Design a protein around this ligand. Structure first.
Ligand SMILES: Cc1cc2nc3c(=O)[nH]c(=O)nc-3n(C[C@H](O)[C@H](O)[C@H](O)COP(=O)(O)O)c2cc1C
Ligand SMILES: Cc1cc2nc3c(=O)[nH]c(=O)nc-3n(C[C@H](O)[C@H](O)[C@H](O)COP(=O)(O)O)c2cc1C
Ligand SMILES: Cc1cc2nc3c(=O)[nH]c(=O)nc-3n(C[C@H](O)[C@H](O)[C@H](O)COP(=O)(O)O)c2cc1C
Ligand SMILES: Cc1cc2nc3c(=O)[nH]c(=O)nc-3n(C[C@H](O)[C@H](O)[C@H](O)COP(=O)(O)O)c2cc1C
Ligand SMILES: NC(=O)N/N=C/c1ccc([N+](=O)[O-])o1
Ligand SMILES: NC(=O)N/N=C/c1ccc([N+](=O)[O-])o1
Ligand SMILES: NC(=O)N/N=C/c1ccc([N+](=O)[O-])o1
Ligand SMILES: NC(=O)N/N=C/c1ccc([N+](=O)[O-])o1
Lengths: 197, 211, 211, 197
């Protein structure tokens, strides 16, 4: 059982989403002693944004012909994609920042959605990832951003992740949210339950 | 004469359609308002710093005037970015749709300019109650998308977390007069994209002539 | 009353000795010159963009006035950084020694402000002949090092590629009046570092009182 | 024979140092068909600068006690160091930018000089890398920056690299420089000779 854990909060010890995610990971490890966890930090480390060079390389009509410089432009992307390919369960921890996700997490997504690698087209688009599942652990300052919540329509954090993840083939996605920064305890207890299965 | 702040979020240069269309609007605006001020803030071709833990600590410091000089340094870019907004009457954001949202640099720009006590505030009616601090401003969002149907009524409307999300974040700080001009079909190109770009230009020219 | 530009290159905040010592100088300068302008440019706690290929293409464009708007965007930060320098009479750089040189952010700041036709130029006496374009400026470099002997006469002088290198880069654009104030022994601390910091402060106070 | 190639120019096809380095690498591969080359791009990709968090983690008095967040702060560094450990020959290509190296290369060095990993102290310092050699391939706009050159004392590019590399244990270092951007041809031919041995 291989887990990729992507932490999106820039905060360390003080991060609630990171802490909850780590509570899940620890419980998961207890119940699956053989598990491996890979951590990809995108909160405390400045992940590069997509550049024009990246666009030219990633959408190259004949990728086998990419120059060495273009391959260099894609090397981080390839590494990030590889972590995803090698994992069965993707865990993403993230704050809501301004009704969406921290910019580093947007940057991660922008690196791993890759034509001919995690999606393709025939234009109609097709996902290429299979057999993967994801758990999103998110913390929010306010309230009512969840399903049936008063502010659901303002939530462009996790519902957006579902869209992007869905596009590349990850369609089994669970969200666990703590709001009001009781809800945390319900999340933590929800996570322990999820981990022991 | 509205003072304009243009925020360009495509990493692409001459080839950016979102940038190009926004520049059509700005030039046309300039023609009708020779003395109007236009400031440009690049967030696409320039890596804009993400929000860090030090930024959070400074921005949310309970006694703001007591921030160390180091903390002030952590907010210096934010202060510059916010200042540009305060100086402007009309905000123009040019942006691609990247993976059903905006490029990460634009997200980072937003994260820098939503500032407690500066562009929004709150009181405790225990239950924090938020209030926007920007007034008298308007925004124009000029966007380009590879595919089709991300606009209202579109087959893929629910997947659109780019401009609808921008409208929400801007509304939070008090910019609720927001217009969206979108070109679609950029990936397929053809003459359907030419028409879409043509319509976008005509729309932008009308807007510029009346702003 | 010299206008001052302070460029802080340590990633550390309250704990930065190089920053602290420079702030001692600035405060003391302020006390003697209440109306003096002081601008701070953070290059340590803020990731400053490296020079890119697009920057090179724009900065070295043979017809500069013909740069596209995208190219101008590529130089916008550089223009801001250069402008700060032009506005100043005295430049104060605070910097650690990091691996026998300066932190990468400070190197990036330098790479942004050495600009053809702006802070230096050249003619072809074929064999390019360079000329600095900054005049009437002075620099003060305040530095802190973990070890000892990196100064003149020091056992490790030849390993020092921090301030001696800064002096060379600044000289290239026309700042040849450069003073270096160094504290050493920061890693060992003890009372040898206390003395070194004390001497640095006394030196900086004298400089501030006469600048 | 394992090679780590660190390219420092932000320029792609147009980069002279990159091109010369690749001429060497190709020739080296011809003569040592079993060779492996790892490429670490630090010119066209924004390598993060050392931060206060990095300092706190890297100089932690009791590293085995580092929190997960601190380990995250060091994960890139650990990866960069690992590439170095796994290599026999380090090749660095770099422009001279303002009498030194591009800032990305300074940032790389700042990630790989690591207490207890590539150097230690007993204070007296001690290198920890062994059996490695390096080749620096550098391109300069001007002239006379080499040994015995009129401008030698202004050169804080490769002579500085020697210092930093020397500090962690890489003391067999060769510099091949092209100046005046004939010298290139002499470098290229110098590189082919070096590669066939
Ligand atoms: C820059 C920033 C933006 C935020 N935006 C929102 C928001 O849009 N909606 C919300 O409910 N809370 C918002 N918050 C509050 C955080 O979501 C809340 O503190 C969350 O628990 C932080 O996650 P973390 O503990 O993992 O760092 C924001 C906080 C910060 C620092
Ligand atoms: C990294 C990347 C992600 C993209 N994601 C989407 C997308 O999610 N939906 C879509 O319709 N088009 C998408 N596109 C296509 C672009 O939106 C389209 O090419 C757009 O014109 C780019 O804006 P620009 O021309 O101003 O640079 C994407 C393009 C890139 C390079
Ligand atoms: C990444 C790093 C590299 C360093 N390299 C050197 C060095 O090469 N020589 C030296 O004497 N001290 C070195 N030091 C020690 C620092 O120069 C010293 O702690 C200095 O005070 C840092 O400056 P600051 O206090 O303003 O942050 C290094 C420290 C760090 C964190
Ligand atoms: C930002 C910048 C700084 C430079 N600084 C120097 C310098 O200090 N001394 C020098 O001789 N040439 C300098 N040059 C010229 C370059 O070193 C020369 O173009 C070199 O061949 C570029 O390397 P590359 O072809 O691998 O990109 C500089 C060039 C640039 C773009
Ligand atoms: N009910 C709400 O609108 N809650 N919003 C919380 C937010 C949004 C932005 C921030 N912020 O601190 O930046 O807090
Ligand atoms: N989803 C669509 O129908 N059209 N958009 C095309 C996309 C989506 C993602 C990307 N991408 O390049 O990452 O292109
Ligand atoms: N070289 C010395 O004698 N003292 N300096 C200490 C150093 C050198 C490099 C580092 N470092 O932390 O990377 O510390
Ligand atoms: N003989 C010289 O001083 N040569 N210097 C060349 C340089 C230094 C900086 C630049 N530059 O283009 O930035 O070129």
């Amino acid at each position: 059982s291989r887990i990729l854990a992507v932490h999106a909060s820039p905060r360390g010890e003080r991060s609630q989403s990171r802490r909850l995610a780590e509570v899940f990971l620890a419980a998961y490890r207890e119940a699956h002693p053989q598990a491996r966890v890979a951590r990809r930090e995108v909160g405390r480390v400045p992940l590069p944004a997509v550049t024009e060079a990246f666009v030219a390389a990633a959408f190259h009509p004949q990728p086998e012909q990419r120059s060495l410089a273009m391959q260099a432009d894609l090397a981080l992307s390839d590494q990030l994609v590889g972590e995803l390919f090698d994992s069965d369960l993707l865990v993403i921890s993230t704050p809501m920042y301004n009704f969406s996700v921290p910019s580093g997490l947007k940057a991660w997504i922008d690196q791993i959605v890759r034509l001919g690698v995690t999606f393709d087209f025939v234009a109609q688009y097709r996902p290429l990832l299979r057999g993967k599942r994801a758990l999103i652990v998110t913390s929010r300052g306010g309230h009512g951003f969840g399903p049936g919540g008063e502010n659901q329509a303002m939530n462009h954090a996790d519902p957006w992740l579902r869209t992007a993840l869905g596009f590349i083939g990850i369609d089994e996605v669970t969200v666990v949210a703590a709001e009001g920064e009781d809800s945390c305890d319900e999340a933590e207890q929800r996570l322990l339950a999820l981990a022991r299965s």
